[PDB]
Amino acid sequence: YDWGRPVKPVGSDWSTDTP
Amino acid sequence: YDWGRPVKPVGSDWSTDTP
Amino acid sequence: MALETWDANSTPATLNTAWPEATDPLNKGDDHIRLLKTVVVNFWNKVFD
Amino acid sequence: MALETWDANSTPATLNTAWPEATDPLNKGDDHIRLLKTVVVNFWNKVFD
Amino acid sequence: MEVTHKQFDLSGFLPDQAPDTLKSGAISRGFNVKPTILGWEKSGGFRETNTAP
Amino acid sequence: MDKATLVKTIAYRMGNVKGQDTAIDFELALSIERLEGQEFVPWFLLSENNFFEGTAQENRIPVPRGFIREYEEGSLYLRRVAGTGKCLIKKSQDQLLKYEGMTGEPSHYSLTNQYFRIYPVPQEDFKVELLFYRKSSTLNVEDNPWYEYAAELLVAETIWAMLSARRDKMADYWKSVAADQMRRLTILDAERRLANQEIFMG
Amino acid sequence: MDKATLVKTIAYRMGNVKGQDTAIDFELALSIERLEGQEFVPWFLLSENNFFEGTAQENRIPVPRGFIREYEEGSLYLRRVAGTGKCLIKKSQDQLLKYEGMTGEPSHYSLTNQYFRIYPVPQEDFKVELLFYRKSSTLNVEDNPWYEYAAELLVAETIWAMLSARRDKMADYWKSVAADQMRRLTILDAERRLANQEIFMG
Amino acid sequence: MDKATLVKTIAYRMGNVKGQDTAIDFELALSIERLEGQEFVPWFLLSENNFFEGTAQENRIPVPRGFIREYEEGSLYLRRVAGTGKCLIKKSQDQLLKYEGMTGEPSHYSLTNQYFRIYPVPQEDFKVELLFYRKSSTLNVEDNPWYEYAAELLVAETIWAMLSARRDKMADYWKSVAADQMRRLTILDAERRLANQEIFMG
Amino acid sequence: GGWESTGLWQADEDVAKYAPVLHYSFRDVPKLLAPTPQALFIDEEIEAVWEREDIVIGSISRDGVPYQDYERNKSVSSISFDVDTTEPFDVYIGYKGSLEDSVEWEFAGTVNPMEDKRLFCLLTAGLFSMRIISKAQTFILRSYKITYEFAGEMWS
Amino acid sequence: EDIVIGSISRDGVPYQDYERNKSVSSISFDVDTTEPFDVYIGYKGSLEDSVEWEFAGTVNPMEDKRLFCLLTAGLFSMRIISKAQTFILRSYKITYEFAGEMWS
């Protein structure tokens, strides 16, 4: 019956260490 | 990138013990 | 007899000399000319390049 | 028209494949055949003796 | 498993025998085809002549 | 991979079959349905935090919709209004009959078929959270997880079903291939779980 | 080797096949896709240092794009503004519920499917770094690493696929060849890694 | 032996084949490429002393061009300007994070994929030396070492590839021959390494 | 006419000037007609039908010749054609439970030999029959084979 | 055209196989002439297709009587062209292997 779900983590991107 | 190599040993010949 | 099975890169290998037979249809005439054109162009491109 | 402009000095470069076409008139069949003959002769001449 | 039935055995139209048993290269119905040593090929068409009464 | 590439590969590796395209989709859905029914549950079927609100005087909490099993490294947590919580403890039902009538916040639970039971029967509305495994059709994600991570297992399973109908022998070869793929997937899951973890006795 | 030499060799060793050239490319891409899905991860799929910035009050950090696994001799490191850092410690989620509400810098973590969780919930923006394995298509390198280092494995695998569709029995032979190549590749990885390393008890 | 004698012998022992001469060269180059990819590295692939100069503030030193593995009875040595030096010590990366910011000459290192890391980050230009194994195409010698010392292994490998394409059965015979040749080569390397060496405990 | 018009390279009379040619009076046609290798009638097309009933599917004799089996059901997977024509054709598959029944037809599909020469269909029945319909200038059929499996026993 | 390459009957006679691709390794000639000749090899995917020709090479019987070429196709044909005083051909054999199935 009453099960609800959590909204997703908004920040989403990792970056990089350049060569 | 920067790898360099060493120059070869100049003296090059062994001799012999005669019969 | 109708036509050598062919495509843009057929070359002189796919030519049957006997294929345009005497009783064969006129409607196949256009195709035979074109097979010959493609073949000539590719041969020239191969050996002049 | 669907017949390439041509002159007695035409190279193999002039022909466009697809030119003799299903809709094209049969009266141009000889002309198309003759183009092929001029094109072939010039290369055997340029490349061979 | 596989079963291979080969034409050009010159049996032809056999509509009187039992279909279940007629051999490969034999058919029970059909038209406008005739049996040769090449297989089961298709017959040609018709042109017109100048004669007209 | 995606559905189109999956269908193309299944058709190609089955003998360059071209006539059938709908049966491939049917047995591709049935393959996922069959795989979800087996004992092994991959990591990508784990759900997110889900909360349930319940009325006072009902100890029975229905099971979540696609429940396959719960997640071991997880728990059912009671979230109190202030934001604090406690982790409820699982015991068998026989073991939890002493509690009938003792009064307070919920502290233990039992799973009996379709229902979770909170035996320290709450006298006021509550709220619990749980992490558990789910059937894919019921996850909230964008694309079936299976397509991305388990594509080669699926191909084999589908090919097996199709061939098995034709009664071909080749089917047992593709079942062995699928078994090997699942065996490798289990080891991959174990390796992913245990990475960067240090264990101390006591 | 490169893509052109790979295609030429695959065509040559499959029986001097000449008609097919596009299917070879298709099953060469699919071969890499299949190999990336298995349990064994070579050394050339290790990424570089990647940093993530996150807002206050969210403990969930999404997984990096091509994540396959976490580098064992690696760690998740918090980089404080001054340039100093601490290494965060992995535990299971059940084990990290005591911390809800205790306050401070992040100190521990859990991986639950698609999310890294920092349970000592930060009250200010943070920054973490990680080394992990990635799918190649997502690497920031010039050419597919696989082409350079594991070329033979690739050829055999491709041949199996193509042959299996034509139903030759030669396939099993090429699968055995690929298995031997992967077995040899596993040993090198260890040797490369364990070279010039001395181990002391305690 | 040399390339011409190798091609002649390969043609002779394959059945006195005469038409093919270019495929033999192609599969002779591919044979060396395949052998270099396996776990066993012979002694003739060891390079000479190579030195690297690096700028201050970069701890990452790229891997040498044909690096297969390093040489165990060797080390990375820091040569100071005066001509003196110290041997740097290898540890895993996790183990070398204490050092971030401690200051001085470099003392330890880690190999993470394509890079060597000097964790006691130098504040001035440095210079290091290393002995390692290399792919042949990148050695400085006159002729491929393989031709001189491993000629009979190569013949067999080439014959195997060629026959395998024809789908001949004889191929498995030549693979067994090549395996025996490599087995003998390993023992020869071990015997060469250990000659005139005395071992004392402690 | 354009290249799309009818004819043969040899004007017809010239062909076989050595022998006669059948002339046909056709009732609704104004002029008399003659046979031609070309298959277009006046201009309109001619259809052909090739049908065999109760193909021999069963065991094979040690001599290498197949013989019919009337006691077990069979399951058909594919049909492979060896033809010389290049133009496309239709193939129908018929199935009957047993001898007393009548044939029931299913449309298998269209076969274009240059693209492919195989056809895939899954059916189980007591007996099988096949029909080929073509409207094309050339159609030569050399052989064909069937892949099948045994599927129990025949009841009615 | 379309040489018989396939299985062999228990009586020792070969028969054609139209359902699998084949791969050709070598052709060996038994001739009585001594002067050299040219050999062409043709290959077609299946019956509906046309033959396409490849130049195999030149055969000088005194030096050798074998010819090596690697090809895979549905069906094979061979052509021999000679300009010499004498040319007698007694037999020939082909070495081949099966290479899957024929599609188009």
| DSSP result, F94-142 | GGG-TTTT--SS--EEEEETTEEEESS--SS-EEEEE-BB--GGGS--S
Cα–Cα distance for residue pair F170/F159, rounded to 1 Å: 9
Q: Is H103 exposed, middle or buried (0-12, 13-18, 19+ CB in 10 A)?
A: exposed
Mutation for J interface: I117, I139, I141, most J CBs within 10 A:
I117
Q: How many CA atoms lie within 13 A of E30 on its CB side?
A: 26
Of F74, F76, F73, residue with least CA distance to F118: F76
Select from I42, I48, I57 the Cβ nearest to the Cβ of E32: I48
Select from C5, C22, C27 the Cβ nearest to the Cβ of I114: C5
Crossing angle of helices G151-166 and G22-36, in 10° steps, is: 120
Contact J90/J30 with Cβ under 8 angstroms?
Answer: yes
* CA angle, residues I45, I51, I55, in degrees to nearest 5: 160
Q: Is F128 exposed, middle or buried (0-12, 13-18, 19+ CB in 10 A)?
A: buried
Of E39, E43, E13, E4, residue with least CA distance to I142: E39
Helix H or strand E encompassing H24: helix H22-36
| Strand-pair partners of G70 | G132
Single-letter code of the amino acid located at J6: G
Cα–Cα distance for residue pair G145/G149, rounded to 1 Å: 6
Q: Within an 8 Å CB–CB cutoff, is residue F17 touching chain I?
A: yes
Q: Which residue of C has its CA nearest to J47?
A: C5
Eight-state DSSP code of residue G98: T
Helix (H, G, I), strand (E, B) or coil at F91: coil
Single-letter code of the amino acid located at F38: Q
Q: Is D23 exposed, middle or buried (0-12, 13-18, 19+ CB in 10 A)?
A: exposed
Of J71, G20, J42, residue with least CA distance to C14: J42
Contact F165/I151 with Cβ under 8 angstroms?
Answer: no
Does the distance separating the beta carbons of F166 and I75 come in below 8 Å? yes
Does the distance separating the beta carbons of I116 and F19 come in below 8 Å? no
Structure tokens at F140: 């909230």
CA–CA min distance F162, chain G (Å):
15
Residues 68 through 107 of chain G touching chain H, CB cutoff 8 Å: 73-75, 77, 83-85, 87
Dihedral-angle region of residue D34 (phi above 0 means left; psi in -120 to 50 means alpha; beta otherwise): alpha
Select from I3, I8, I86 the Cβ nearest to the Cβ of C30: I3
For residue J18, how far is the Cα from the chain centroid? 16
**Radius of gyration of chain H from its Cα atoms, rounded to whole angstroms:** 22
CA dihedral I14, I16, I22, I25 (to 10 degrees): -10
Cα–Cα distance for residue pair G17/G24, rounded to 1 Å: 10
Chains in contact with B, where contact requires at least 3 CB pairs less than 8 Å apart: H
CB atoms within 10 A of CB H191: 9
Q: How many CA atoms lie within 13 A of H55 on its CB side?
A: 3
Resolution of this PDB entry, in A?
3.6
Q: Is H166 exposed, middle or buried (0-12, 13-18, 19+ CB in 10 A)?
A: buried
CA–CA min distance F173, chain I (Å):
18
* CA angle, residues G135, G138, G140, in degrees to nearest 5: 120
> Which residues in chain H touch residue G192, judged by CB atoms under 8 angstroms apart?
68-70, 111
Maximum CA extent, chain J: 44
Cα–Cα distance for residue pair H168/H179, rounded to 1 Å: 19
Eight-state DSSP code of residue H114: T
Structure tokens at H113: 């994929």
Contact I79/I144 with Cβ under 8 angstroms?
Answer: yes
Contact G109/G90 with Cβ under 8 angstroms?
Answer: yes
Q: Is G74 exposed, middle or buried (0-12, 13-18, 19+ CB in 10 A)?
A: buried
Cα–Cα distance for residue pair G191/H43, rounded to 1 Å: 15
Contact I31/E49 with Cβ under 8 angstroms?
Answer: yes
Select from J18, J48, J103 the Cβ nearest to the Cβ of I143: J18
Structure tokens at H96: 């070398």
Sign of CA dihedral I116, I118, I123, I126: positive
Q: Is I77 exposed, middle or buried (0-12, 13-18, 19+ CB in 10 A)?
A: buried
Single-letter code of the amino acid located at J40: Y
Of H152, H161, H135, residue with least CA distance to H188: H152
Antiparallel, parallel or unpaired: β F108-112 and F85-90: parallel
For residue G6, how far is the Cα from the chain centroid? 23
Does the distance separating the beta carbons of A19 and G55 come in below 8 Å? no
Tokens 């069979």 correspond to I74
Does the distance separating the beta carbons of E45 and I39 come in below 8 Å? yes
Crossing angle of helices H22-36 and G3-13, in 10° steps, is: 110
Contact I54/I127 with Cβ under 8 angstroms?
Answer: yes
CA–CA min distance J100, chain C (Å):
23
Contact J7/J15 with Cβ under 8 angstroms?
Answer: yes
Does the distance separating the beta carbons of F49 and A2 come in below 8 Å? no
Does the distance separating the beta carbons of G113 and F152 come in below 8 Å? no
Mutation for I interface: E49, E50, E51, most I CBs within 10 A:
E49
Of J4, J56, J66, residue with least CA distance to J30: J66
CB atoms within 10 A of CB F11: 19
Cα–Cα distance for residue pair J29/J68, rounded to 1 Å: 12
Structure tokens at H151: 């000629």
Helix (H, G, I), strand (E, B) or coil at H11: helix
Contact F52/F128 with Cβ under 8 angstroms?
Answer: yes
> Which residues in chain A touch residue G140, judged by CB atoms under 8 angstroms apart?
16, 19
Of H136, H68, H92, residue with least CA distance to G191: H68
CA–CA min distance C13, chain J (Å):
6
> Which residues in chain E touch residue I60, judged by CB atoms under 8 angstroms apart?
1, 3
Antiparallel, parallel or unpaired: β E33-35 and E40-42: antiparallel
Of G113, G46, A1, residue with least CA distance to F49: G113
Q: What phi, psi does E11 have (nearest 5°)? A: -105, -50
Size of interface C-J (CB pairs under 8 A): 13
Burial I6-42 (b: 16+ CB within 10 A, else e): bbbeeebeebeeeeeeeeeeeeeeeebbbebbbbbbe
Q: How many CA atoms lie within 13 A of H118 on its CB side?
A: 31
Cα–Cα distance for residue pair C41/D16, rounded to 1 Å: 9
Contact D14/D39 with Cβ under 8 angstroms?
Answer: yes
Q: Within an 8 Å CB–CB cutoff, is residue D19 touching chain C?
A: yes
User: Given strand A3-4, what is the order of strands in its sheet?
Assistant: A3-4, F50-54, F126-130, F76-79, F85-90, F108-112, F115-118, F60-62
Of H120, H98, H97, H123, residue with least CA distance to H108: H120
Of G77, G121, G112, residue with least CA distance to G93: G112
Does the distance separating the beta carbons of C27 and I9 come in below 8 Å? no
Cα–Cα distance for residue pair E53/I32, rounded to 1 Å: 9
Residues 6+ apart with CB under 8 A from F137: F66
Select from G46, G149, G196 the Cβ nearest to the Cβ of H37: G149
Select from B1, B2, B6 the Cβ nearest to the Cβ of H49: B6
Single-letter code of the amino acid located at D35: L
Q: Which residue of H has its CA nearest to B6?
A: H49
- Helix/strand/coil (H/E/C) assignment for every residue in chain B: CCEECCCCCCCCCCCCCCC
Q: Within an 8 Å CB–CB cutoff, is residue E33 touching chain I?
A: yes
Structure tokens at H149: 């010392």
First to last CA, chain E: 62
CA–CA min distance I63, chain E (Å):
14
**Radius of gyration of chain I from its Cα atoms, rounded to whole angstroms:** 21
Select from F15, F184, F191 the Cβ nearest to the Cβ of G165: F15
Q: Which residue of F has its CA nearest to I76?
A: F166
